[PDB]
Input
Amino acid sequence: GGALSYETEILTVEYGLLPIGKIVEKRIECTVYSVDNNGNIYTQPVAQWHDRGEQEVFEYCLEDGSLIRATKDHKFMVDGQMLPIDEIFERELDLMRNPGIKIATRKYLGKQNVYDIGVERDHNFALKNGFIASNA
Amino acid sequence: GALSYETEILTVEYGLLPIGKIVEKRIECTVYSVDNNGNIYTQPVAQWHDRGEQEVFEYCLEDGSLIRATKDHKFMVDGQMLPIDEIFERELDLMRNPGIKIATRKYLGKQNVYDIGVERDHNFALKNGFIASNA
Output
């Protein structure tokens, strides 16, 4: 089974993001998001709240510098497979994550010298994180 | 439209490079594009455009990462190229690298720790859409 650190943020329908420590310690009734064997995202209630006691926690820092704090043996989704996170780390596999992400806020920075690149076909190019910039 | 100097471009020969160093130095290199069929291919840079001083906006995404660009510069949304400002206006999702590697691992010693059970499939989504599993 394995376990997660207190502040690991869990998506709930009712409350939005909540720390799993709080969901478990307060045994909060909520609806979480799951994925089936055919890649369908659905929702269902939390059915068991597991307080696993004390265990060794490792902090896994991802390429974008975000953090997952878990025991070595907790499984995470990699393409078509659930694997222990430590193995995912040892094997350099990509964790599955949301294919999309929203813009939270916007700021003005005034004027700057700015740049663009032309390519022959399709007229786009990937940035860090895999964002696709385009001139079309 | 255009982009800030330090916008990191993924190139084959050098990995991630600031578009500013690529354009200013006319660096010959190979970038990654998508076609109309969702398919990612490689392709040399054909033009290096210094578009001069323009108004730049900083777009901060839900994960705290930034895009710095002119308001009109288009970016891909679920198969469709749209001005980044419009993507902001309508709260649309940018695409879309659906996976990410772990760079490093540190020991934090012992902590009280937790897990949740569900009735079907035995997984659940975290922030950023990671899928934690106890199947």
Q: What stands out?
A: Chain A is about 10% helix and 55% strand. The CA atoms of residues 15 and 30 of chain A lie 8 Å apart. Residues 1-136 of chain A form a domain with the Endonuclease - Pi-scei; Chain A, domain 1 fold (CATH 2.170.16.10). Helices of chain A lie at 20-25, 85-90.
